[PDB]
Amino acid sequence: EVQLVESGGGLVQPGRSLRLSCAASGFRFDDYALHWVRQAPEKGLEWVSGISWNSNNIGYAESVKGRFTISRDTAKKSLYLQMNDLRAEDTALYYCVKDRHYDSSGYFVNGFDI
């Protein structure tokens, strides 16, 4: 069965970084696009970062650019988010996202499933 499990979150101090991990099960990892979304209380939803199967295309939002880094490894079957210089805006509920068309965007078929 398809599940995505997020771990590594917690409380941090300014100037301190942390490590997020996204471990998932039930589907083959080597052909799917994965993305990060955070949910802060009562301000809707906003995108963080993403990755594809080849990881050649990596994108960040300009508000969060320059201090995040997304990484992924097939052997350990998990998605990794690297934080640097954590600030006040970072306080949100972080979601881990899988796509259905192995790529970021642009195609006729794309969508967030699990």
Partner: protein, 49 residues
Amino acid sequence: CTLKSFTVEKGIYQTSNFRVQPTESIVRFPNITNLCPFDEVFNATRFAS
């Protein structure tokens, strides 16, 4: 018409079978169960270059 004539003498004759019986056709075979994995190659998300 099995003696090939129109007059027959007294006695008992051993004729042949000229009545025609219609027939049908039938065929049976075992249970098709072990299909080939065509979906994996024809319905894959990504194709190699």
